């Protein structure tokens, strides 16, 4: 019954993807290339306030009207932001999907941005940042990106503390007018026909300009931030530059991630096929957790090792994981382990596109990144095309590359970058 994913690029650059699966629950997303990476050092945290400003007054629908109508039809509105792009998703049943469609398009394309609303919303900025920073690996990833990049990927996803109380309405208007333009958006629908989606696209999404602002190419620096905060667990991340999205080598890096361990497969398991867990676990009698970290962005890459250990044994855990990756980089690997890593990657992709939310996130990401819809069979085919020598080359690129380290906890025994 989901017979075809039907795809259309309009002449203004706006992408429209729709799939009529006749599901009882329609889901419609708008994907904008307007992430946190497009701010410079003058308007930091503007994307966080824009993410929190999805329920403000629009020129066509007030905030009370938007909230009451969305909760009256039972649907929901969500904003999902990475460093690269943002996604505005609305969820509802088919019989009142269109009221949600004017609500979504009004919020995304015509904000009013009244200054008393954003003055009320900066306290929500502070609360949201505290709730997100409640757990340590969020701050580790933020500090790791700030270590790794000079600009255009090191901008934080969450608003800095000094910028709270200072983000104005004209900064939000400038960000929307320069980044929410027609050539950087994809409208994706599950449970709707192409005709309704394309007619609301020509009735809403034709008043914007073009390609907008370019960016700053995200150059690499490296370094180290150590945040001594006296936690019982030391969190460390050691990363290096890797391939970008669209490079074939990045696929090899993904295989290398599943060669080293990208998460457990058994609730309370020993991670027997994880090479990092096998290399660290033989010399540790106290709890730890080690995995491979992979992050591919449209112009850059970051592959590395994440370790969580005790304060007194952080050095031996980090050194054992680094020696395991160095042993992988010297051609010491089994082809059965590469096949198991490929099976893990294929199963992870097919389980990620299993739900409708993950499916529409995949379609929107593909439409923004490449302007086309790639079938999952073709994705698995190019996963199976990866050679093991490419995995050795990816591990050698990680080993010989300049490192970037973010650590937190009681770092009295955590080694430095030159001490590795």
């Amino acid at each position: 019954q989901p017979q075809d994913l039907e795809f259309t690029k309009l002449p203004n650059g706006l992408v429209i993807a729709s799939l009529e699966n006749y599901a009882p629950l329609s889901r419609i997303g708008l994907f904008v290339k307007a992430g946190s990476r497009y701010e410079d050092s003058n308007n930091l945290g503007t994307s966080h306030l824009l993410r929190l400003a999805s329920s403000l007054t629009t020129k066509g629908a007030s905030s009370f009207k938007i909230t009451r109508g969305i909760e009256a039809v039972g649907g929901k509105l969500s904003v999902t932001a990475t460093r690269e792009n943002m996604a505005y998703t609305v969820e509802g049943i088919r019989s009142d999907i269109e009221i949600l469609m004017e609500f979504l398009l009004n919020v995304t394309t015509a904000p009013e941005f009244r200054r008393w609303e954003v003055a009320a919303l900066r306290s929500q900025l502070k609360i949201d940042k505290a709730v997100a920073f409640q757990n340590s690996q969020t701050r580790i990833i933020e500090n790791l990106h700030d270590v790794a990049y000079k600009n255009a990927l090191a901008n934080p996803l969450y608003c800095p503390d000094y910028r709270m109380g200072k983000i104005t309405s004209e900064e939000l208007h400038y960000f929307v007018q320069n980044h929410f333009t027609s050539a950087r958006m994809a409208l994706v629908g599950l449970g709707v026909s192409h005709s309704v989606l394309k007619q609301v696209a020509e009735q809403f999404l034709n008043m914007r300009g073009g390609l907008g602002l370019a960016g700053a190419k995200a150059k690499y620096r490296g370094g180290e931030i150590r945040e001594q905060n006296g936690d019982n667990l030391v969190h460390a991340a050691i990363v290096a530059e890797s391939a970008a999205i669209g490079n074939a080598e990045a696929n090899a890096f993904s295989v290398l991630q599943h060669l080293l361990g990208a998460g457990p497969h058994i609730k309370r398991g020993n991670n027997t096929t994880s090479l990092l867990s096998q290399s660290v676990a033989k010399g540790s009698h106290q709890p730890f957790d080690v995995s491979a970290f992979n992050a591919s962005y449209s112009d850059s890459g970051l592959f590395g090792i994440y370790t969580i250990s005790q304060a007194a044994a952080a050095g031996e855990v980090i050194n054992a994981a680094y020696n395991q990756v160095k042993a992988v980089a010297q051609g010491n690997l089994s082809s059965a382990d590469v096949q198991a890593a490929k099976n893990k990657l294929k199963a992870g992709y097919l389980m990620s596109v299993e739900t409708s939310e993950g499916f529409l996130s995949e379609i929107g990401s593909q439409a923004l990144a490449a302007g086309s819809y790639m079938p999952p069979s073709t994705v698995l085919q190019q996963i199976d095309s990866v050679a093991d020598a490419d995995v050795v080359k990816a591990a050698k690129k990680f080993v010989s590359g300049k490192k970037s380290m973010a650590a937190s906890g009681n770092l009295g025994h955590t080694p430095f970058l030159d001490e590795l």
């Binding site: 019954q1 009882p24 629950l25 039972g74 019989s95 709730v131 199963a347």
Partner: protein
């Protein structure tokens, strides 16, 4: 493409019964993945206070080695194919479920047939998992909502097996032996209380053939003919309060007795919960939220969060609300919460009932998304109702609910009832049981 025929277009769950009496149910989709699980009608309600940690300790021990796959081999060929292995235990059900690809469907099934049937329970592994469970309960001590819901069960179901936790007390964890685990397995892992459920890219005849080849000729006979029964559990209007002023926030749960699984009034009660709803401090709605409790909690800065629950067991349950807030707001929060309940007993209008019906419809259709929650729903449905209730039947039962029967059901289950109260944290301003009990009715009505 209307909602009614869209719910008719959902595939029918196909159910068959083996010779030993275990149910085999499947729902087919076009996904390339699948979720295959085993649901066992066993939990902490079936324990007699000497083996109170038995099911928890067996689900710790289930993936650590069997007779045909000793030690860490079962890990090796569950994760050589990229499959994910999960298990959980409630007070009434136990689940062992595998997420895998469709083409690995046979081996996964016999892996399940290797887990619930031929588990090897080694003694050093018993010692290791005893220490692991002790420190995992130490970890769970610092999560306040788990402590509050355990306190709510313990004070609402006093003297019954429903009061005790799934993990059990720590002394039982210290002194469970291998013989008690084998007795628990041979008493509760019987074929007529097992459902093999599958969702996704699963062919039902292939699943039935694999269940005939692997899951046949197991159990079905009590060896001493000592057939257990499920006695009803007495609800007790009571209060437990654990005052500890060093904690930063206070968690309070207030519940009344629910009707149970088989009562259709749950559907109406679910609509009632959808009128009250939930709120968290990161919600973007603010003051314009449709729930009056959430709007007054935003406007008066009362609560960190609140939620409503309808937990159902075999002809019983807890229907109520849990909120976390600072101390100085606690009593005020209780007041507004009780007011909403009395509003649903007395002055429920059709607009909020229609909103709650839409919220419930969206909630259940959004929950049935993906192979894992569909297989989870199939397992619970055949364990509780004896059948898989189709989604069009749920829509009909939702659409038959109006404001009059919502008022009647809310008055029958809420008005002038003795609640169970659990509190943890700075709960000095948490009101007395007499004040809460007086707030459970109105003098104006």
């Amino acid at each position: 493409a209307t909602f009614a025929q869209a719910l008719q277009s959902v595939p029918e769950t196909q159910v068959s019964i083996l010779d030993n009496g275990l149910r085999v149910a499947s729902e087919q989709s076009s996904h390339a993945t699948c979720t295959v699980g085993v649901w066992i009608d066993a939990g902490s309600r079936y324990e007699t206070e000497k083996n109170n940690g038995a099911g928890y300790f067996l689900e710790h021990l289930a993936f650590k080695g069997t007779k045909n796959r000793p030690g860490n081999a079962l890990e090796k060929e569950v994760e050589s194919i990229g499959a994910h292995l999960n298990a959980y235990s409630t007070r009434e059900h136990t689940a062992y479920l595998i997420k895998a690809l469709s083409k690995d469907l046979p081996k996964v099934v016999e892996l399940l047939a290797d887990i619930v049937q031929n588990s090897s329970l080694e003694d050093s592994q018993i010692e290791k998992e005893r220490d692991v469970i002790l420190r995992e309960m130490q970890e769970n001590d610092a999560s306040m909502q788990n402590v509050v819901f355990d306190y709510l069960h313990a004070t609402a179901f006093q003297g019954t097996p429903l009061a005790q936790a799934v993990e059990g007390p720590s002394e039982n964890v210290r002194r469970l032996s291998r013989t008690d685990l084998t007795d628990y397995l041979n008493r509760h892992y019987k074929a007529p209380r097992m459902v093999l459920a599958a969702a996704g890219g699963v062919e039902h005849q292939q699943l039935l053939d694999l269940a005939q080849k692997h899951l046949s000729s197991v159990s079905r006979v009590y060896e001493e003919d000592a057939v257990p029964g499920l006695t009803p559990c007495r609800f007790t209007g009571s209060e437990i309060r654990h005052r500890d002023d060093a904690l930063p926030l206070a968690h309070v749960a207030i519940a009344v007795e629910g009707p149970g699984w088989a009562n259709p009034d749950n559907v109406t009660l679910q609509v009632a919960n959808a009128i009250i709803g939930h709120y968290d401090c990161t919600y973007g709605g603010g003051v314009h939220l449709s729930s009056p409790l959430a709007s007054v909690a935003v406007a008066n800065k009362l609560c960190q969060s609140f939620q409503t629950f309808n937990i159902s067991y075999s002809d019983t349950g807890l229907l109520g609300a849990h909120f976390v807030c600072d101390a100085m707001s606690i009593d005020d929060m209780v007041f507004f919460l009780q007011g909403q309940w009395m509003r649903l007993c007395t002055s429920a209008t059709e607009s909020e009932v229609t909103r709650g019906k839409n919220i419930l419809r969206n909630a259940l259709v959004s929950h049935l998304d993906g192979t894992t929650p569909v297989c989870e729903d199939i397992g619970r449905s055949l364990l509780t109702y004896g059948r898989r209730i189709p989604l069009a039947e749920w829509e009909s039962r939702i659409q038959e609910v109006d404001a009059q029967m919502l008022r009647d059901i809310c008055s029958k289950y809420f008005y002038d009832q003795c609640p169970a109260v659990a509190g943890y944290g700075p709960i000095e301003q948490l009101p007395d049981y007499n004040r809460i009990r007086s707030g459970m009715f109105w003098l104006r009505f």
